[PDB]
Ligand binder design. Structure first.
Ligand SMILES: Nc1ncnc2c1ncn2[C@@H]1O[C@H](COP(=O)(O)OP(=O)(O)O)[C@@H](O)[C@H]1O
Ligand SMILES: Nc1ncnc2c1ncn2[C@@H]1O[C@H](COP(=O)(O)OP(=O)(O)O)[C@@H](O)[C@H]1O
Ligand SMILES: [Mg+2]
Ligand SMILES: [Mg+2]
Lengths: 521, 44, 528
């Protein structure tokens, strides 16, 4: 009391009440994104301190924009981020799953049960569920060259069914599949460019098997040179082409006016040497990351050539990959093997802007998207929707197993776990039962968002699954139950496996905390 | 006036009657300010 | 365990929230307000708005895009409406105020359906299907025009229709013809593209609005470099230079050491030798007038004067390239590279002087076939000049749209009435609870004729019903609202014409924006 142990202002809480409070906070976090799930899901608008707004349906984004400061609640944000990083789809199912796991075992915690029994039960249940998912998933060994594209198209269509571009999904899915059939063996995401141009309808978006990029700042003379070519050769450069000092360290000392004139002529001779070396290689289009002067612009205009400067590095690498040359930092050897080759080059007007198009390359490992919308958040949400489909297609190319969506696999796992629980005695039975009952929050949320009676549909689904109907889920349009494997609602098994592992890990971590201490400041 | 606020704080809007009243008052005031200096016997 | 107030979100005590229909309803209200501001600015009988800037400047305008751009709004739905209008301006250029009215009417009509127990996704789906039906029907009633230099009459009629709603309508035949001539002179026909950097629009206060003219040359805000040079040339051979009239100078660091008297005298001779050399190099090639991007010296100025060769100083880069394209010359960076084949030719170069002020301007005219054209606007107010510029831009954009696609429809509300009839007829065959959404779309598609009638001083419901009955009875989709009171309801003989892409864009863009608005159910924002 004269001298205290810790610094003044340290806040400590311990016992059952703090665990119950943590479980309560997780419910609020899950409620924040509860009604964004399914074909009938809405979306949220968030405004920050500066005034900019953002409209989203993606769970990870919404959780990121919320300034959560509760230590127990931050875990649900972390698991959503991890799920987004790994598979790219399913960042709301995991949150609801974790919250339901906590809420179903809250009453047992209230009775005074040791949390390690709960943790053991969760670990056993998760292992059993993952093994069942790996067992019952459908795969084809040597499917086809055409039955291997249709599967990816179905996966993309399912991935787009709850987004802003749902009505045009059949139009978009196709495109994204093509996008990932050109991306080599590493499938780098930087090889796909996304360009967003204001004005236009959503059906005016396009995919170019080639490259396209915006017009750069230009000097006088740019409007006096041709703007269409048929078989051009492209020179990609990393050299600054303008009249300038040779080096910052340079210094010139001279004694006669004749040598003064010679020095004056030397710079022009150097610049013209570079320009003639570029010209004699046969190139018709030149691109450079470094500035191009007005003298070079007029020189190229006088010989019917096209030039661009300050091109972004990503666009230049993309052009290299599409056309097949190499970036040159020197002009002393511009051979035929270091130049690109396209089939059409053009500059076109797209809704108030000018865009350069290189098209007609069949050896291209690159595609580019042009998205047409009506407002900034519209194209941003379109791009966010397309990213999920891209990631799903990449994951589906490697491992190709598919399970049915709509809640079929949730109910199958719930039935399996309930059948397993009756075998073992003790509190393990009750805990496995709670875990099994927590798995049917997905079909219930689908029905609730749609606007049905969830109790009747859940009873019918339970009866259908217990009898026999492995792939039976909810039909939203017909307001009933239906086979979701013949209605083509497919999704890779990695999504469910990762979601279960992450949700179980978060629940186990949150349950095992005894007390919380906060230091001042 | 609609209950929802469309404008920032300090922004202002005047509609038909008030707009015409303001415009006509301003124009007539400007005219009568300088009426007095017209013709061979105007003042300064 | 006493769940006392525990913190989840930073600044939880000041932030607000709205959930459910109430939030939805709020959005609708905001949208309606915005639309009700623009409704009175539609048609040939519409009025204008006056915006006072943040620094006190005044702008009198009629464009929807500019109106929504200068407003400072706080509600997010208002900003979405502003951006919808801006996008329509960006692609088409005309029809910036019809789209916001259509969106506001659509949102208003969705309210009663929301009150009857319909999921907003169902309303959005019905709107999308109705929009597809309307767009499919729209190109079935469209006629082509023909785009060719010889005729130019349909294009003049289209520009007249576009300009009929502006304050420039006191002389809109002249301005329509100016716009069509300018676009036809600049346009590229094989690639079907035009470039607005080759059209220079600029105005000067004073004179009369009818003094506005078209110059198939260039006009710059400069004058000759010596007060005693001649004010006109009639066979101009233009030499275009990028180098200043000074002795050369290397860019890298340099020093010239003077160590004696002979070195001093040699440098002194070298200077004037350089001056005489550059003047002689200019004169030898046969040039008659010189144009420079940079400044001169006193010696260079007097040497240009003494050798009977006028010059212009300190002209900008874009002006240099426009003069090069107009006169057919080439831009050279040195005197050594000047040759007789790189000179441009101009039939007349003159220095024009305006009224009691000291200003001057330089005009280059009577060039050969030129790809650069200038619009010269006059008027007695600055606001008049600004609005004339905006109206001319609208006309140019419309003619560009006609260049891109050459089939048109008829205005006055005829197209909207026909589309509404088609949508309702299709909706009569839809029994799957979606007929309500289609009928809402058809009802909200009929606010344009009603707005036109209300602005013109007639009675909306009776006029619209009469025209609808006539269209059903007869078989012509070219019957609209007689806004100018010429007696006839037929828009094909009244010559009211609009582009098809404009209508298609209005419908599709408004529908997609409405669908985006309907999807939102939650909103979180900090308090103030
Ligand atoms: N056509 C469909 N019919 C029924 N359910 C569907 C359909 N398409 C998708 N779903 C369901 O939507 C749910 C996911 O919605 P979504 O917002 O994508 O959540 P997440 O991003 O977590 O996957 C999945 O459980 C899936 O079963
Ligand atoms: N002579 C006319 N008679 C009837 N309607 C007209 C006439 N001229 C224009 N309109 C109508 O005016 C509308 C255009 O409104 P306007 O004020 O020009 O702005 P915007 O073109 O941006 O909609 C068109 O729907 C057209 O049908
Ligand atoms: Mg998803
Ligand atoms: Mg108009």
């Amino acid at each position: 009391t004269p001298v205290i142990l810790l610094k003044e202002g340290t806040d400590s809480s311990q016992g059952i009440p703090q665990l119950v409070s943590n479980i309560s906070a997780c419910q609020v976090i899950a409620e924040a994104v509860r009604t964004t799930l399914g074909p009938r899901g809405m979306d949220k608008l968030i405004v920050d301190g500066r005034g900019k707004a953002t409209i989203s349906n993606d769970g990870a984004t919404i959780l990121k924009l919320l300034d959560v400061v509760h230590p127990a609640a931050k875990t649900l944000v972390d698991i959503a981020k991890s799920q987004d990083a790994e598979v790219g789809d399913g960042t709301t199912s995991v949150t609801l799953l974790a919250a339901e796991f906590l809420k179903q075992v809250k009453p047992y915690v209230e009775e005074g049960l040791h949390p390690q029994i709960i943790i053991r039960a969760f670990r056993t249940a998760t292992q059993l569920a993952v093994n069942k998912i790996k067992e019952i998933a459908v795969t084809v060994k040597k499917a086809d060259k055409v039955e291997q594209r249709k599967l990816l198209e179905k996966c993309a269509m399912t991935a787009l069914s709850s987004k802003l571009i749902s009505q045009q999904k059949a139009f978009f899915a196709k495109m994204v599949v093509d996008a990932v059939m050109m991306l080599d063996d590493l499938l780098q995401l930087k090889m796909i460019g996304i360009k967003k141009v204001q004005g236009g309808a959503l059906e005016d978006s396009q995919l170019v098997a080639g490259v396209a990029f915006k017009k750069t700042f230009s000097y006088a003379g740019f409007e006096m040179q041709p703007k269409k070519y048929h078989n051009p050769k492209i020179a990609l450069l990393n050299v600054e082409l303008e009249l300038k000092a040779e080096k910052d360290n340079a210094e010139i000392r001279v004694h006669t006016v004749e040598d003064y004139q010679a020095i004056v002529d030397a710079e022009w001779n150097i610049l013209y040497d570079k320009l003639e070396k570029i010209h004699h290689s046969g190139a018709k289009v030149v691109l450079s990351k470094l500035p191009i002067g007005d003298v070079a612009t007029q020189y190229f205009a006088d010989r019917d050539m096209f030039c661009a400067g300050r091109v972004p590095e990503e666009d230049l690498k993309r052009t290299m990959m599409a056309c097949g040359g190499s970036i040159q930092t020197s002009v002393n050897a511009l051979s035929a093997d270091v130049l690109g080759r396209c089939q059409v080059f053009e500059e076109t007007q797209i809704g108030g802007e000018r865009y350069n198009f290189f098209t007609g390359c069949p050896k291209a490992k690159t595609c580019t998207f042009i998205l047409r919308g009506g407002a900034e958040q519209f194209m941003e949400e379109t791009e966010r929707s397309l990213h999920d489909a891209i990631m799903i297609v990449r994951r589906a190319i490697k491992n190709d197993s598919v399970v049915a969506g709509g809640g079929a696999i949730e109910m199958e796992l719930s039935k399996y776990l309930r059948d397993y629980s009756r075998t073992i005695p003790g509190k393990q039975q009750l805990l496995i039962g709670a875990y099994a009952k927590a798995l049917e929050i997905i079909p219930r949320q689908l029905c609730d968002n749609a606007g049905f009676d969830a109790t009747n549909i859940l009873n019918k689904l339970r009866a259908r699954h217990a009898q026999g109907g492995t792939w039976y889920g909810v039909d939203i349009n017909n307001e009933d139950i239906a086979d979701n494997f013949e209605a083509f609602v497919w999704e890779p098994a990695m999504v469910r496996i990762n979601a279960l592992t992450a949700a179980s890990e978060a629940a186990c971590l949150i349950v095992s905390v005894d007390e919380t201490i906060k230091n001042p400041r | 006036l609609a209950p929802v606020n469309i404008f920032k704080a300090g922004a202002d809007e005047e509609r038909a009657e008030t707009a015409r009243l303001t415009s006509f008052i301003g124009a007539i005031a400007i005219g009568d300010l300088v009426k007095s200096t017209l013709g061979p016997k105007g003042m300064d | 365990e006493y769940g006392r107030p525990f913190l989840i979100i930073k600044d939880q005590d000041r932030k607000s929230r709205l959930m459910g229909l109430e939030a939805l309803k709020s959005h609708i209200m905001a949208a309606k307000a915005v639309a009700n501001t623009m409704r009175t600015s539609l048609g040939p009988n519409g009025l204008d708005k006056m915006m006072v800037d943040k620094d006190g400047d005044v702008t009198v305008t009629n464009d929807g895009a500019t109106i929504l751009s200068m407003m400072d709004v706080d509600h997010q739905i208002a900003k979405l409406m502003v951006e919808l209008s801006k996008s329509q301006d960006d692609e088409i250029g005309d029809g910036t105020t019809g789209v916001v009215v259509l969106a506001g009417a659509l949102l208003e009509e969705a309210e009663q359906l929301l009150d009857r127990g319909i999921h907003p996704i169902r309303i959005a789906d019905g709107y999308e299907q109705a929009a597809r039906v309307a767009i499919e029907h729209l190109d079935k009633i469209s006629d082509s025009v023909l785009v060719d230099i010889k005729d130019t009459e349909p294009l003049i009629q289209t520009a007249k229709t576009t300009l009929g709603s502006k304050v420039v309508n006191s002389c809109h035949r002249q301005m329509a013809e100016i716009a069509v001539n300018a676009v036809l002179t600049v346009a590229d026909m094989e690639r079907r593209d035009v470039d607005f950097e080759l059209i220079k629009v600029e105005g000067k206060v004073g004179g009369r609005l009818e003094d506005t003219k078209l110059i198939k040359g260039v006009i710059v805000d400069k004058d000759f470099s010596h007060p005693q040079m001649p004010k006109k040339v009639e066979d101009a051979k233009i030499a275009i230079l990028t180098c200043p009239f000074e002795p050369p100078k290397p860019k890298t660091k340099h020093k010239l050491d003077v160590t004696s008297v002979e070195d001093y005298k040699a440098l002194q001779k070298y200077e004037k030798e350089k001056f005489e050399e550059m003047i002689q190099q200019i004169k030898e090639t046969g040039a008659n007038l010189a144009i420079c991007q940079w400044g001169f010296d006193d010696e260079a100025n007097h040497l240009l004067l003494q050798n009977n060769l006028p010059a212009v100083r300190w002209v900008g880069g874009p002006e240099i390239e426009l003069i090069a394209i107009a006169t057919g010359g080439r831009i050279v960076p040195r005197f050594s590279e000047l040759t007789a084949e790189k000179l441009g030719f101009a039939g007349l170069v003159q220095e024009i002087s305006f009224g009691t002020t000291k200003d001057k301007m330089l005009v280059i005219e009577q060039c050969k076939n030129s790809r650069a054209v200038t619009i010269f606007i006059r008027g007695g107010n600055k606001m008049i000049i600004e609005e004339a510029k905006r109206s001319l831009h609208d006309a140019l954009c419309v003619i560009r749209n006609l260049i891109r696609d050459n089939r048109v429809v008829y205005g006055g509300g005829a197209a909207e009435i026909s589309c509404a009839l088609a949508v309702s007829q299709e909706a009569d065959k839809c029994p799957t609870l979606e007929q309500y959404a289609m009928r809402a779309f058809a009802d909200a598609l009929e606010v344009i004729p009603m707005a036109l009638s209300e602005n013109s001083g007639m009675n909306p419901i009776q006029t619209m019903t009469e025209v609808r009955a006539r269209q059903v009875k007869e078989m012509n989709p070219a019957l609209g609202i007689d806004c100018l009171h010429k007696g006839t309801n037929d828009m094909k003989q009244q010559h009211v014409i609009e582009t098809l892409i404009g209508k298609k864009q209005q419908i599709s863009l408004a529908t997609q924006m409405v669908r985006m608005i309907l999807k939102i159910d939650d909103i979180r924002k900090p308090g103030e």
